[PDB]
């Protein structure tokens, strides 16, 4: 055997918030200034270490634009954990989180693990969504919240680890 558990992750979220960039930070440990508009769907692979046991995480990337929802909707059921990403510098992205959870309620598993990420925490001059205001929303819902920068190494690593633990504990 190679891995002890395989968990299926899905990066849901608005468009241009940082999903693609995040996945590249965690799975490849790079960051590229433009990268590429994510069209359709695909995944990157990364196996980690947690509480003795070894975990193969396969993490799926999505297209943000609304029209693309009915295409990626199919890829929710098979997900152990779904990560809702918004950009802290963009007010609509945070305002849309509410709609994204509505998608998770609609398409994802009955008991799926959730996590809410505010990305681009490195842009302090342009920060719009409030640190304590996002935390409070998450807390009311019973979801882990983290603020992450994919540009700086910052906090990208811990986000996925926090998600992997939550799935594991639930899984048995």
């Amino acid at each position: 055997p190679e891995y002890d558990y395989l968990f299926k992750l899905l990066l849901i979220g608005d468009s241009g918030v940082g999903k693609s960039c995040l996945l590249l930070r965690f799975a490849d440990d790079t960051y590229t200034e433009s990268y590429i508009s994510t069209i359709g769907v695909d995944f990157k692979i990364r196996t980690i270490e947690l509480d003795g046991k070894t975990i193969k995480l396969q993490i799926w990337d999505t297209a943000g634009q609304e029209r693309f929802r009915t295409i990626t909707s199919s890829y929710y059921r098979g997900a152990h954990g779904i990560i809702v990403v918004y950009d802290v510098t963009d007010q609509e992205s945070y305002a849309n989180v509410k709609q994204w959870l509505q998608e998770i309620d609609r398409y994802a598993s009955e008991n799926v693990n959730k996590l809410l990420v505010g990305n681009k925490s490195d842009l302090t001059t342009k920060k719009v969504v409030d640190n304590t205001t996002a935390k409070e929303f998450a807390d009311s819902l019973g979801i882990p919240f983290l603020e992450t920068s994919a540009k700086n190494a910052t906090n990208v690593e811990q986000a996925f680890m926090t998600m992997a633990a939550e799935i594991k504990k639930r899984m048995g």
């Binding site: 468009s15 433009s34 359709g40 295409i71």
Partner: protein, 280 residues
């Protein structure tokens, strides 16, 4: 190749000069090995191929194009991340100018045609035209395209596009029934060709010279051609799709990770013959 190419330029020029433009022979030249060769030939030919008049005056771009357009933010977003489609050589100042141009073409077409809906990926098409035809020509040609070949990709919903994508499988079944049965076992679906179909393989193929030569081929043929081209690729990749785990993740990622060295000219000829053999 040289003398054979020299002939083609003379053939293509003879067809443009013909008493009425020999569009038939231009399509035929576009499908044949090498496409339309220089982008300069294309500036002449492509307009003939789309029936847009090359010598028309430019469309009027009104005062506050970006300001009032509902699609400014999204388009801007995609154009920013279009960087890799530009030649490595061209300097930032020039590239940014073209990018600023690219945003304006898209937003205008979207304005001139209210029924058309922007989608992520449209920008890969427009930028291809922008770098061949040029801003003035690209804007008129893509409009024609947007209302015919890409007409379904710009419907409010993804419905017609999904339907087009579904073709891929009945086509594979006609040529390699066993492969079709393997892929269905895996439940790969057809969303691996989304990028391919919607951007005319422009989002996915790295080498620009190969992208325009594909555009040559797509302009001359039927609107649904790109999917028959997708089918031909999967079929060409038979022994890797089968020699591979029969679960979605494995097959989806494999097809998704498209080879950079396809036998374009061989695949095109297969696409053609497959289109005529199993027509839509």
């Amino acid at each position: 190749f040289n003398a054979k190419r020299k002939k083609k330029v003379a053939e293509i020029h003879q067809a443009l000069n013909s008493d009425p433009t020999d569009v038939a022979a231009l399509r035929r030249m576009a499908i044949s090995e090498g496409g339309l060769l220089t982008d300069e030939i294309r500036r002449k030919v492509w307009p003939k191929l789309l029936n847009v008049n090359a010598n028309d005056p430019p469309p009027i771009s009104g005062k506050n194009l970006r300001q009032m357009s509902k699609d400014y933010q999204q388009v801007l977003l995609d154009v920013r991340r279009s960087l890799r489609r530009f030649p490595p050589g061209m300097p930032e100042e020039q590239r940014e100018g073209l990018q600023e141009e690219l945003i304006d073409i898209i937003l205008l077409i979207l304005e001139r045609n209210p029924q058309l809906h922007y989608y992520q990926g449209y920008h890969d098409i427009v930028v291809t035209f922008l770098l061949v035809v040029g801003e003035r020509l690209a804007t008129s040609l893509v409009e024609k395209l947007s209302t015919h070949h890409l007409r379904d990709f710009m419907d409010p919903t993804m419905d017609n596009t999904k339907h087009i994508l579904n073709y891929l499988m009945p086509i594979i079944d006609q040529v390699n029934p066993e492969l079709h049965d393997f892929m269905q076992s895996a439940e790969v679906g057809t969303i691996f060709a989304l990028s391919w179909l919607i951007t005319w393989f422009g989002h996915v193929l790295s080498d620009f010279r190969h992208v325009v030569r594909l555009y040559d081929f797509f302009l001359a043929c039927h609107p649904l051609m790109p999917i028959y081209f997708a089918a031909v690729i999967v079929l060409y990749r038979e022994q890797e799709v089968l020699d591979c785990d029969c679960d979605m993740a494995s097959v989806h990622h494999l097809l998704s990770q498209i080879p950079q060295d396809l036998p374009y000219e061989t695949l095109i000829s297969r696409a053609g013959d497959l289109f005529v053999q199993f027509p839509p």
